[PDB]
Amino acid sequence: MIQRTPKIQVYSRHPAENGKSNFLNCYVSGFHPSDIEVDLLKNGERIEKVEHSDLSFSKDWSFYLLYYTEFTPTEKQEYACRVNHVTLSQPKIVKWDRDM
């Protein structure tokens, strides 16, 4: 058996083909087992509609999830990614840095 804690990165991207659109991303990497719970938050509340949830593995024991959706951030909103996994005794909340 192997278990590996996810690394979690939260960032925003503009697709170059539609630069006015803005996507909030949670990249959850190198975890095992694959069982996981991942939400994007807006001021502490789960975002219900996340349009993209892309899972892959490299080695049979290394998983990668890109969890992202279109958003419209304002300076006064707080965005984050919340991850639950067997390796995390408490849910891990990673805040979006506005400049990322």
Side-chain angles (χ1 to χ4, degrees):
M1 67 82 79
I2 184 150
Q3 59 190 24
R4 290 218 193 200
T5 300
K7 168 158 144 265
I8 302 161
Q9 303 167 92
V10 188
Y11 56 88
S12 64
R13 300 288 179 258
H14 303 271
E17 287 166 13
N18 193 190
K20 289 169 288 133
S21 84
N22 198 2
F23 286 73
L24 178 58
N25 298 261
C26 190
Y27 181 48
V28 187
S29 59
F31 62 93
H32 202 260
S34 59
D35 305 61
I36 205 168
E37 193 190 9
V38 180
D39 285 293
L40 298 176
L41 308 185
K42 180 181 177 205
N43 301 321
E45 305 197 317
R46 291 174 188 188
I47 299 172
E48 167 179 342
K49 297 142 68 86
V50 181
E51 273 175 308
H52 301 284
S53 193
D54 296 341
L55 187 76
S56 66
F57 60 87
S58 52
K59 297 288 184 212
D60 287 357
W61 52 92
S62 197
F63 283 76
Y64 303 86
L65 176 71
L66 188 69
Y67 188 69
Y68 67 111
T69 209
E70 193 163 356
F71 83 145
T72 302
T74 77
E75 295 307 335
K76 279 164 49 145
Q77 282 157 351
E78 284 156 356
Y79 291 90
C81 189
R82 184 174 62 207
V83 182
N84 284 290
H85 193 260
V86 289
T87 57
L88 295 167
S89 51
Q90 291 282 28
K92 191 156 172 60
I93 305 165
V94 178
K95 297 179 178 192
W96 181 51
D97 178 345
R98 189 66 26 144
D99 285 304
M100 236 81 70

